[PDB]
Every structure is written in structure tokens, then in C-alpha cells.
Copies of this chain bind each other. A is one copy, B any other.
Amino acid sequence: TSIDIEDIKKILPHRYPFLLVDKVIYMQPNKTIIGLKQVSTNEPFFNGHFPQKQIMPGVLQIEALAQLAGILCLKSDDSQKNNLFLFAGVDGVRWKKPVLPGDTLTMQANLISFKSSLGIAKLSGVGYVNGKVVINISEMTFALS
């Protein structure tokens, strides 16, 4: 069930300058989510990372997947009417290639386990630019309090 940005803002509480999901292109509740982040020079972090060379900070690639993963969780089960999800842990992150201004960051997050009893969700994540892997995440752990 594809998606436009206004509806993302209804699901996630993130705003500027920390909303890092531009569009959700495919979603299957309780299973997988595919979305994208457009990487433009006209973004506030770029001036600091770095003046002489513009490279999207790896941590913000984590944040982007984590937000996409967080959308999946909130659509998969919103019985807990709390959209404030906090990152509890992340594991096995590997950055292969620099993400640069001009790139389309295509992202996929996959739900591993949900314990709606605690609020404990675990997800994996991969990000691509031009079909080539730029970031891998073995395991994102989330906790809505």
C-alpha cells in the first residue's frame, strides 16, 4: 500500500530536521517495508559533514532505516497508541559505500520479532543506491514507552 509524505507525518512524530523518510513505496504489515530517502545538497547536515566533502553521515543512514522500521511497527500493531518509539539497541552495522548528494537512498526493513507484551520489536535493514548495497543492519531493537 504505497505512500505520500503527509501520511508519514501522521504515523511518525519526527519532524524537520530529523525526518529521514521521504516516501514509503511498499509495505506488508508484520513483514517488510520499502521506502526511500532523497539525498540533496540542500539539507542542513551537509554543511557540517563535511565542508570540503559532502557525505551523508552514516548515523543518519541508520536513523533513516530505523524510522522506516518504526513505520512498519506502528502500522503492524497500533493497539499501543504511542507513536514515540525509542531506539534501544542496534547491532551489526556496516557501511560499504558513501552516500552522496544526488543519490536516491532506497531502504528495506524486515521485521524479525515483535513482543507486543513488552513493546520489544527487532528488525533488520538494508539501504541501496543504484541497486548497490550502501548500508547493512543486522538488528535494530525498538521500545515504545
Q: Which residues of A contact B (CB under 8 A)?
A: 4-6, 8, 13-23, 36-55, 57-60, 62-63, 66, 84, 86-95, 98, 100-104, 141
Contacts and interface: CB of A to CB of B under 8 A. Distances in A.
B101 A47 contact: no
B94 A88 contact: yes
B41 A16 contact: yes
B98 A38 contact: no
Contact of A91 (B4, B14, B54, B92): B92
Given A13-B51, A86-B98, A90-B90, A57 B18 contact: yes
6 contacts: A5-B100, A6-B53, A13-B50, A13-B53, A21-B41, A40-B42
Contact of A39 (B38, B47, B93): B38
A20 B102 CA distance: 11
Contacts of A88: 94-95
B48 A15 contact: yes
